[PDB]
């Protein structure tokens, strides 16, 4: 039933990012708005760093291992890919 060169949605949603036919990223930039000041900073999905608001320095996310935790109801808006 299946083609190798045109795989179904259900098969390739499962695969590892390297095992895709493509090699894509699993990450995205979110548009984050600090709760303490109304201000907007782009934040990378997997942050691996302390990320602070610019006006107030709030530490808007935790580094935690897989995927960074945003802080305390700060608004995320997910940016496009392009």
């Amino acid at each position: 039933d299946a083609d190798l060169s045109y795989p179904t949605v259900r098969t390739e949603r499962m695969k590892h990012k390297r095992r895709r036919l493509v090699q894509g990223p699993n990450s995205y930039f979110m548009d984050v708005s600090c709760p303490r000041c109304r201000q907007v900073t782009v934040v990378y999905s997997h942050a691996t760093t302390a990320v602070e608001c610019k006006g107030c320095s709030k530490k808007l996310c935790r580094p935690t291992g897989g995927k960074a935790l945003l802080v305390e109801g700060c608004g995320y808006r997910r940016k496009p890919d392009h």
Binding site: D3, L4, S5, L21, V22, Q23
Partner: protein
């Protein structure tokens, strides 16, 4: 440690033809892997390719029609003078009729029969019956 990227390529085709698969997906495409396949395709032993861009090294997806018995690579790539087609015809091919030995020549990758007629010799790559 991918030593020869044909070795890896033509095994998969070989060992996924022995299983009756309709398609094979081959990991590191290369200028030689294509030119080899396009010789297989000339004589009817493979249907179609897709060469997919990863931006790095492609991935070939070959449609098998069921007509391949084996695909080798000859690893050290011994030479052939045009008088040496009889060794390779004799040792690596099943009959003097239907096999093919693929060579690299000045003129390019081609069969041992395309080479006898053009009189070039070259280095051996592989075979397919």
């Amino acid at each position: 440690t991918m030593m020869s990227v044909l070795a890896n390529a033509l095994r998969t085709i070989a060992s996924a033809e022995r299983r009756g698969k309709r398609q094979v997906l081959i990991r590191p495409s290369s200028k030689v892997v294509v030119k080899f396949l396009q010789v297989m395709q000339k004589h009817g032993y493979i249907g179609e390719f897709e060469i997919i861009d990863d931006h790095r090294a492609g991935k070939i997806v070959v449609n098998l029609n069921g007509r391949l018995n084996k695909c080798g690579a000859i690893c050290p790539r011994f030479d052939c003078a045009t008088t040496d087609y009889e060794k390779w015809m004799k040792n690596i091919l099943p009959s003097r009729q239907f096999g093919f030995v693929v060579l690299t020549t000045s003129l390019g990758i081609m069969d041992h029969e395309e080479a006898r007629s053009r009189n070039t010799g070259g280095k051996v790559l592989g075979f397919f019956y």
